[PDB]
Amino acid sequence: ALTLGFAQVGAESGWRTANTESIKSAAEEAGVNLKFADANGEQEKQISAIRSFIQQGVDVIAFSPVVRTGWDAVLQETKNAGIPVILTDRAVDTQDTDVYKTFIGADFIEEGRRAGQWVADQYASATGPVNIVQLEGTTGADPAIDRKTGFAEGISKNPNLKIVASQTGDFTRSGGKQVMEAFLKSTPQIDVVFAQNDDMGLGAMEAIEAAGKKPGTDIKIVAVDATHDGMQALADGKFNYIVECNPLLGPELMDLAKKVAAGEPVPERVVTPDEAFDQAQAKAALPNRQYKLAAALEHHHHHH
């Protein structure tokens, strides 16, 4: 039977631990002998997992690139070993191809854009300036850059909206906590927080709590992911809006791995769907969430 090697980022994230369960249990039903790597968020241990996959004679290799740059070498290596690659979740910035067989992930630019468009459509009648603080993702990672851009454009057509402060927090609760108290520190007027992942939004929520006033009413928070704790916080009113990012790639990852090993053809991009929730919708969405997320993913779409 099939043997798949997967080189995962780390466990910075509730999304990432969800995603890791999806890959582990997905391999476990698909009948796939999975060999699984956690690079603790650092690129070179991921590349070493890759080389040890080539070095084991894996039939397929798949990973999610921590950040975009610096994979040419190891991708040409699997290139030459005869190892198909399947990209998951995050993109790589490479300039020679047939280095991999497909890329399955969300469209982060549009996640940012619909967060930005929510912000813009709330403050559509703000008489004066309305002040945005951005908790940014691990500098260099596909999602941080794309959500960066997309949210920028989403707020781009209401001139009252501008981002007063925005700096990186490594997609973490403690990161969001930390940068959120730095911005509590310097910025004196903060209306909305945009958290590139809702773990950082939860940390920032604690920082606002600690300063003594109320996430969800005084400072509004908008975040990306739709994690369990994200959604419970949104339902409780301490977030305002959350845009879904669907971590349950496991199963279509296994389908794709089988098709790429067997030499069946597979589409060049697979995009996972998203929706967004306000408070009420989140409180409706929680029941039987993992089932609903799996149906959501079965509704992915291809780019040909």
Ligand X SMILES: C[C@@H](O)[C@@H]1O[C@@H](O)[C@H](O)[C@H]1O
Binding site for a second copy (CB under 8 A): 51, 55, 67-70, 72-73, 80, 93, 95-97, 107, 109-110, 113, 121, 124, 139-140, 145, 149, 152-153, 156-157, 264-265, 268-269, 271, 273-275, 292, 295-296, 298-304
Using CA atoms, how far apart are residues 246 and 213, in angstroms rounded to an integer? Answer: 31
25 binds, among a second copy, Zn ion, ligand X, none (CB under 5 to 8 A by kind): Zn ion
- Give Cα 88 to chain centroid, integer Å: 11
How many whole angstroms separate alpha carbon 224 and alpha carbon 112?
8
CA distances from 172 to 30, 50, 68, 130, 178 (A): 31, 25, 19, 26, 10
Binding track, positions 132-151, relative to Zn ion; x by CB under 5 A: ----------x---x-----
Q: Which of 159, 219, 148, 217 is nearest to 188 (CA)?
A: 219
Question: What sign does the dihedral 252-257-260-264 (CA atoms) show?
Answer: negative
**To the nearest whole angstrom, how small is the minimum distance from the Cβ of residue 273 to ligand X?**
14
Q: How far is the CB of 171 from Zn ion (least distance, A)?
A: 16
Alpha carbons 145 and 133: distance in angstroms, whole number: 16
From candidates 54, 184, 271, 286, binder to Zn ion by CB under 5 A = 271
**Residue with smaller CB distance to a second copy, 128 or 265:** 265
Taking CB under 5 A as the rule, which mask of x and - marks residues 209-238 in contact with Zn ion?
-------------------x----------
- Binders in 3-32 for ligand X, by CB under 6 A: 12-13, 15-16
Q: Which residues contact 288 (CB under 8 A, 6 or more apart)?
A: none
Partner whose binding site includes residue 186, from Zn ion, ligand X, a second copy, none (CB under 5 to 8 Å by kind): none
Which of ligand X, Zn ion, a second copy, none sits in contact with 89, Cβ below 5 to 8 A by type? ligand X
Find the binder of ligand X among 49, 67, 180, 245 (CB under 6 A).
Answer: 245
Alpha carbon distance 3, 32 (integer Å): 6
Would you say 92 and 75 are in contact if contact means Cβ atoms under 8 Å apart?
A: yes
Binding mask 48-87 for ligand X (x = CB under 6 A): ----------------------------------------
Query: Which of 17, 25, 52, 167 lies at the binding interface for Zn ion (CB under 5 A)?
Result: 25
Closest approach, Cβ 292 to Zn ion, in A, equals 6
Residue 157 vs 228, nearer CB to Zn ion: 228
Instruction: Note the residues at the interface with ligand X (CB under 6 A).
Output: 12-13, 15-16, 89-90, 143, 171, 197, 199, 224-225, 245
Instruction: Note the residues at the interface with Zn ion (CB under 5 A).
Output: 25, 72, 91, 95-96, 142, 146, 228, 244, 267, 271, 275, 296, 302-303
